[model samples]
Target: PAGKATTEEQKLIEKINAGFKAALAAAAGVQPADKYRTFVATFGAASNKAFAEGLSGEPKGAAESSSKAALTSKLDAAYKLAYKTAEGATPEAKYDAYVATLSEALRIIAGTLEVHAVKPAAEEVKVIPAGELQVIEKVDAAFKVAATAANAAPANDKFTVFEAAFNDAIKASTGGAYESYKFIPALEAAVKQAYAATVATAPEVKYTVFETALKKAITAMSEAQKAAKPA
Candidate 1:
């Protein structure tokens, strides 16, 4: 008979994997080029802590450092090549490449966390309202481009490709993510009205959108991770 993983074991594994993935993605997104300082400042500490925990009792020097350095160099070369090829690229193509590279970096980071036994931060990635979803999809196409670029590269090349690709994707995603918000400040006005309407009576029921719930969940996950002990 196959041995079954206990609930605790399964949960532990899940947390480690999720936390690691989130940290890597967050790191990539907050690269110098992207400069999403707020997001990085908010999440970096938690992510780094989780990454340390994932390292477990492994030695944190020499071979790992050399491997990472080599991988980075390779990726930098690939990125430059891709950029050169993109000299005559269309606006759409440039955006597409950027997004594809970002998505790929995210995917790789998630995989790395899992492999390294890092828990991914708990963030509720949700299905938004249909209209929001449509907009997200359009912007997400740009992310897909970055994702594709990253995916095409070798596994060892992740650390390098991640930063550039993710930064590009962020520019695209952010532009799209906040476009409607900028144009229609009152778009989510109903949420505010509902929040005020219920603040006195249903104080427990906070936030009018699922996005808020997702953010809360992510925060909770990070807190839980902080409380967890290393293996």
Candidate 2:
């Protein structure tokens, strides 16, 4: 029970981390070397190892820390790998997976951001069409809120802290019984949009996508608990 929740939460965090790596890779046209390992699990191959070492190292750490210059060069290198061994027989399929991965990461961040917003009514995340301005604004905004939240909480508390907030949300939503696989099928099924998602497109709908999916899963869980409660 307690242990199971920890496993599920860890799995959720792993996906979100992958999402961040994927987003960074997608931004500059790279396939994250780490994601290549995820590849063997999803599709499978021997060349994956060589490609896993493909563009490895830089982008994984650079995405969160390098700030800019490193992010661009390394991400582009990753893109080369993706283009080289990118799965599927078609370009669209290859590219779309990249966006889906990016959108998914940004979306998870927004979902966690909701818990940090100042006012309860202001909790929703809508991608402002202002582009770079919005991107720059939210980056600072998220950082400040995260700092504030950390000052205010223990590691396990997402109501104040942001790091693993979405997983916290998942645990609470599931009443501690959610399987690791339950939330994933939903993310996998939802990202088929034709809307071009790029690094530029990140701040826009990510929150909305995450909000919609989170609530959908939580609602289903809530109902299941509701029905089970009477028994």
Candidate 3:
């Protein structure tokens, strides 16, 4: 493990950790927006780690706090610009602006990963369900066949095969269980896909914590929006 990358990676990690320290230093007594910024800094570290591992390295060694802080600063700058441009904008607009800033921050993070040649983590992890490795294996095998077809077949034909394979995998895993268990939650899948796409692009943003900030922001925005409405 002794090499140039090891030393370089250590340096990067130190830089990122330093950025985390600086962000926390500035966070005292700051409310609302501060919390959102803090979430970005902290979870950004987590997401960065996730990306590093996917690239066959330790994230702790690669995520630099300074770089992360810079990303946060960029997000703030973009948000400020949007706020100035949309003066007296509706709450929904403001909310949209904030989300856009977040998305941009994520993109910036993703770009950082790309610069390092990092890749997104795999979408699915196979977990054993207590005497069900066979089911899992069968399901995985089914997907492999479908994936092979995807590589060889036409687009829609590939998609159909994938869909059927996915459905079959579900049945194999769940033993053809109840309709509720068999259901495909497209709405939830859409939301997850959006999130994954963000991670795919910006694997440095810790989305779990981002979700927390998002929930808080949504609540605050809802209240602010409600007040903005004519009663």
Candidate 4:
């Protein structure tokens, strides 16, 4: 490709996709919460590539130390990830945080090779608990509704339809799956905040309230997704 983004993004995507498969295999039920298991899952392939390329100078680059140091940094990060895993309390949280640290480490290694992650962040993980997720989902639903309405017909000129879909999303995550219990776990938190903000206002007014809620939540969810690597 002519563009650096084209080449770099492609390389980044390939490594991430390969890493995803290795992650799944390592995290298989057997050692799902083990610190080393999580580390291996997230960084195994990347570390291997770094080490293999660094050590095998048969086809070397300008700076062999760059590749070697990349491997060293990743290994050191694995140790830090292990310590963090021990620090985080819950079993599930421990595994998630460990994997996040490893992913961050891999991204650093990729950067050394002029391949960069599309969405890189240096922030710590912020867990979205069940109570807050309900609000986030509902607001996200409102964004979907707004986007759909701006697009066309089915989004017809009806507030009732809009509200119905909005609430439906609060209950039904998507396509008839009412995983509401997982997120109360909040027709109330979302309903209370958004509704009170709108004060039974008109559709246009409603949009602003939903807009505010969704945008903030959108950022939060985006970060959470990056940290958790749900995508």
CA lDDT of each candidate? 0.45, 0.42, 0.49, 0.55
User: Which candidate do you rate higher for TM-score, 2 or 4?
Assistant: 4
lDDT of 1 by residue, 53-106 (tens): 544232644465453343334434444454455556787687457435544643
Q: What value of lDDT does candidate 2 attain over all alpha carbons?
A: 0.42
For residues 1-82, write the lDDT of model 2, one tens digit per residue.
5543332222343444454454344445445465544443433222232234333334446353343333334434454444
Error of 4 at 50 (Å): 5.4
Best by lDDT: 4
Give the distance in Å from residue 16's predicted Cα in candidate 2 to where it truly belongs.
Answer: 73
Q: After aligning candidate 2 to the native by TM-score, how far in Å is the CA of 43 from where it should be?
A: 77
User: What's model 4's TM-score?
Assistant: 0.30
lDDT of 3 by residue, 1-231 (tens): 544543333345445544544544455556757665664566566546533633333466565555445544654576456546555667767645654554555456445544465467756644422333233344335646666765576534654564565556566656655222223223244434545554455555444333344344334434532344443
Q: Which candidate number maximizes TM-score?
A: 4
Error of 4 at 205 (Å): 86
Return model 1's CA RMSD, one decimal.
33.2
Error of 2 at 45 (Å): 81
What is the lDDT, from 0 to 100, of the residue 20 in candidate 3?
44
- Kindly give the number of clashing pairs for every candidate: 31, 5, 6, 0
